[PDB]
Amino acid sequence: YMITLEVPARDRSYAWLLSWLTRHSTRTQHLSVETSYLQHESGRISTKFEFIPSPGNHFIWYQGKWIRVERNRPWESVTFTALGTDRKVFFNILEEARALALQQEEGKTVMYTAVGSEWRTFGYPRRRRPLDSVVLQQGLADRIVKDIREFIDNPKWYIDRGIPYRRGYLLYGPPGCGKSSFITALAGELEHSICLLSLTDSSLSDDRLNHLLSVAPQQSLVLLEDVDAAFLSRDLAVENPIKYQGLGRLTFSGLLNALDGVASTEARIVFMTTNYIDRLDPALIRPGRVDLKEYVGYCSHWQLTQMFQRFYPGQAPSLAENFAEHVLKATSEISPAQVQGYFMLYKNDPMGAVHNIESL
Amino acid sequence: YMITLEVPARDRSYAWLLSWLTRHSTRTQHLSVETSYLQHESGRISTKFEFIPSPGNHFIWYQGKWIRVERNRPWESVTFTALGTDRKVFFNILEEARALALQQEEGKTVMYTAVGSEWRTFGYPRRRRPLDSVVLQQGLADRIVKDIREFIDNPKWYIDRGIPYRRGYLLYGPPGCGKSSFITALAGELEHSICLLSLTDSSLSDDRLNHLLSVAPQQSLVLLEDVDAAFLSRDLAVENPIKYQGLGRLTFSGLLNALDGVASTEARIVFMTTNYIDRLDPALIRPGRVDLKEYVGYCSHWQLTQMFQRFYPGQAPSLAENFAEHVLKATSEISPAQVQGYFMLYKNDPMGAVHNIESL
Numbered sequence: 001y002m003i004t005l006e007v008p009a010r011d012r013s014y015a016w017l018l019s020w021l022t023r024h025s026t027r028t029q030h031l032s033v034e035t036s037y038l039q040h041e042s043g044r045i046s047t048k049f050e051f052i053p054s055p056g057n058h059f060i061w062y063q064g065k066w067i068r069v070e071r072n073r074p075w076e077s078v079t080f081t082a083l084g085t086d087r088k089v090f091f092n093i094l095e096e097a098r099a100l101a102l103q104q105e106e107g108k109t110v111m112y113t114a115v116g117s118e119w120r121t122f123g124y125p126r127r128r129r130p131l132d133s134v135v136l137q138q139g140l141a142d143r144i145v146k147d148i149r150e151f152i153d154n155p156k157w158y159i160d161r162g163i164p165y166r167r168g169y170l171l172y173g174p175p176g177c178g179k180s181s182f183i184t185a186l187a188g189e190l191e192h193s194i195c196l197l198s199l200t201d202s203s204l205s206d207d208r209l210n211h212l213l214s215v216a217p218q219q220s221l222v223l224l225e226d227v228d229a230a231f232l233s234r235d236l237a238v239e240n241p242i243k244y245q246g247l248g249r250l251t252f253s254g255l256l257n258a259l260d261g262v263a264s265t266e267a268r269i270v271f272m273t274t275n276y277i278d279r280l281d282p283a284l285i286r287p288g289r290v291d292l293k294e295y296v297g298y299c300s301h302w303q304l305t306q307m308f309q310r311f312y313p314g315q316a317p318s319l320a321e322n323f324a325e326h327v328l329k330a331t332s333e334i335s336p337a338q339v340q341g342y343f344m345l346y347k348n349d350p351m352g353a354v355h356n357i358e359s360l
Numbered sequence: 361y362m363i364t365l366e367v368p369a370r371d372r373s374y375a376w377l378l379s380w381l382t383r384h385s386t387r388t389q390h391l392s393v394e395t396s397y398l399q400h401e402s403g404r405i406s407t408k409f410e411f412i413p414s415p416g417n418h419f420i421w422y423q424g425k426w427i428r429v430e431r432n433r434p435w436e437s438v439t440f441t442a443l444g445t446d447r448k449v450f451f452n453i454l455e456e457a458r459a460l461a462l463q464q465e466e467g468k469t470v471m472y473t474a475v476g477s478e479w480r481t482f483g484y485p486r487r488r489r490p491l492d493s494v495v496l497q498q499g500l501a502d503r504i505v506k507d508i509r510e511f512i513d514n515p516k517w518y519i520d521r522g523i524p525y526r527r528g529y530l531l532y533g534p535p536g537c538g539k540s541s542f543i544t545a546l547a548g549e550l551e552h553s554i555c556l557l558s559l560t561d562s563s564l565s566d567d568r569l570n571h572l573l574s575v576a577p578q579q580s581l582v583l584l585e586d587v588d589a590a591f592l593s594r595d596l597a598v599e600n601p602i603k604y605q606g607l608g609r610l611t612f613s614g615l616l617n618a619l620d621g622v623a624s625t626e627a628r629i630v631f632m633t634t635n636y637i638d639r640l641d642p643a644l645i646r647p648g649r650v651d652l653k654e655y656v657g658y659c660s661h662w663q664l665t666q667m668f669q670r671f672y673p674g675q676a677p678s679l680a681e682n683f684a685e686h687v688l689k690a691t692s693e694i695s696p697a698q699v700q701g702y703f704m705l706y707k708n709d710p711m712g713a714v715h716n717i718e719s720l
């Protein structure tokens with residue numbers, strides 16, 4: 001007569017329990033190697049050998065209870081066998097795992113990915129990019145931030161009238177203007193998580209897409225990259241229905257219904273990005289599926305001035321005006337990425353980038 | 361009650377442990393044959409019979425502590441069973457393996473390859489090609505060397521402003537000018553390692569590409585050969601999205617996001633090479649993905665003079681000028697490979713190659 005808690009692979013606290021188990025690896029006869037390396041120079045690579053508990057029946061001594069944990073071997077199922085019928089040590093283990101895991105993810109953003117029909121973490125948590133480090137047009141980031149915050153902070157007004165509690169944004173522009181960087185900065189600012197989804201995968205179908213959109217982690221953003229490339233449209237639409245033009249078991253109607261249909265879930269934010277706004281079917285970007293669409297374009301006077309004052313802090317304000325005037329006179333259209341590269345050429349050299357502005 | 365260290369196939373020190381195990385092959389009842397052969401002449405091939413320890417349970421007598429090693433058998437795993445609970449002998453074994461392995465790789469370059477979704481070594485370490493042995497245009501190798509060194513030696517400046525710590529270079533030119541040779545010479549000079557990646561493989565997908573680009577070995581270079589051949593573009597781009605045109609499950613957007621997106625890693629250098637600069641999509645070679653693009657072309661006066669003074673050391677300087685003048689007068693465009701071949705015809709024969717210069 002014991003208690004045999006079973007936690008299979010498909011659990012939200014799976015990573016939390018794994019992290020706690022790596023924390024409590026002491027007094028474990030079976031082990032797995034946990035060595036990492038950090039090269040410095042001269043062929044002297046630092047060694048960091050440690051001990052991940054192997055998928056075995058290691059006996060743990062938490063609170064003096066001789067708790068037995070077994071991880072099997074691609075189907076995985078972790079087991080926490082104990083004595084008697086208490087269930088309190090389970091509460092304590094889950095709480096300690098939560099305290100340890102959330103401590104690790106502090107000041108960072110967690111990136112998930114679509115594995116099969118489920119979300120799994122993708123590498124270590126990444127350092128968040130400061131929002132002010134990305135410079136957009138005047139009064140553009142503020143509008144998006146305010147709209148997202150207003151959507152988050154007003155759930156009651158949605159339910160009191162019956163509108164589904166959903167939202168979606170679309171960003172389009174020339175390549176190299178700040179779409180992905182702004183998305184990353186916004187995710188860092190809002191303390192959310194990014195879920196990467198590809199519409200051209202070979203293991204995606206309508207039912208799997210619906211399940212993925214239904215089981216997305218809470219306090220997270222869903223990102224769709226290059227929606228245009230997954231469906232040729234427009235000129236085709238005038239003759240025949242929208243074909244797939246990709247590798248996968250997906251259809252246009254399935255995606256349209258999954259984004260906003262009858263079975264769509266609630267409290268979800270979706271971001272989509274494209275480079276050709278004119279290649280998207282009108283039914284896909286109608287209100288209800290894409291509430292706000294914004295255009296990010298080439299550089300301007302204020303954007304160039306802000307970028308200059310950001311890359312060379314402490315300089316006089318006249319230098320930024322000189323740089324902006326010279327850049328806008330020498331060339332008409334220019335991308336922020338090219339400006340960033342040109343600045344990267346002249347590292348810590350103000351008044352040097354204000355002379356060699358020949359980048360035609 | 362023992363300690364059972366488990367090191368599976370997917371480990372960095374796997375090769376180090378294998379090399380140490382081949383070093384400590386003494387006192388091993390089970391063996392595998394280690395014969396190598398070196399032909400000289402007259403059907404007399406020198407034998408080098410030795411003993412690789414077979415994948416068995418050989419008992420080792422390191423430090424007088426009876427250690428029971430075991431390699432199983434696709435799926436491969438190595439086990440180091442010991443006595444008691446000490447963990448010191450594991451540290452000593454790892455340190456000795458590091459000392460032995462790094463001793464072997466001295467003055468050479470290690471070439472990795474993409475097996476499945478992991479990097480594995482490809483043959484014995486190769487002898488490094490001296491940097492000066494590759495002659496490029498005046499002030500071209502120095503610029504690239506300085507830029508790479510500056511990127512390596514300034515990680516703080518990247519972090520203090522938020523730019524991702526990444527870089528990428530592109531080399532393009534006519535076939536037979538020194539792209540791959542210069543890449544090899546630079547890798548030898550910088551004491552890095554080369555990782556070969558093919559975009560046309562049949563076992564490559566977006567997730568696998570991202571995982572490979574994330575787990576690349578430290579102090580290494582990532583090489584992409586003939587990026588143009590993996591994606592037809594330009595004239596197609598004016599009508600329809602970029603097709604893949606190959607054998608494999610890869611997409612243009614997937615490669616674009618993997619090279620520089622949201623989930624891209626840090627501290628990575630990527631080299632790409634092509635022969636048709638006009639067949640590359642503009643979005644692929646924008647700044648942020650290709651920080652520096654350089655053109656290697658046909659021979660010039662200084663290049664020919666340096667090549668002549670390199671292939672025939674000790675000759676008077678007037679002979680180099682005579683050879684350069686005659687070559688540039690008899691022909692307008694010529695590749696360094698053709699000059700190397702023409703010199704190879706006249707081995708150790710200066711003043712002979714300055715007469716038979718008819719290679720129209």
Ligand SMILES: Nc1ncnc2c1ncn2[C@@H]1O[C@H](COP(=O)(O)OP(=O)(O)OP(=O)(O)O)[C@@H](O)[C@H]1O
Pocket residue numbers: 133134135136174175176177178179180181182275336337340523524620621643647648
């Ligand atoms: N507005 C901006 N402010 C600062 N840096 C920027 C800006 N736009 C782009 N960059 C920089 O340029 C590089 C590429 O930016 P990013 O990937 O966000 O461009 P993008 O518009 O998403 O391009 P693509 O459409 O090809 O994905 C990064 O180094 C990024 O930091």
Ligand SMILES: Nc1ncnc2c1ncn2[C@@H]1O[C@H](COP(=O)(O)OP(=O)(O)OP(=O)(O)O)[C@@H](O)[C@H]1O
Pocket residue numbers: 493494495496534535536537538539540541542635696697700
């Ligand atoms: N600049 C050079 N100096 C010395 N040898 C050179 C030079 N360029 C080419 N060679 C020699 O020519 C041969 C081919 O060189 P390499 O493979 O680097 O050319 P490549 O430009 O990479 O050609 P491809 O585009 O076909 O790969 C080698 O023997 C190489 O040593």
Ligand SMILES: [Mg+2]
Pocket residue numbers: 179180181620621
């Ligand atoms: Mg992007």
Ligand SMILES: [Mg+2]
Pocket residue numbers: 539540541
């Ligand atoms: Mg080559």
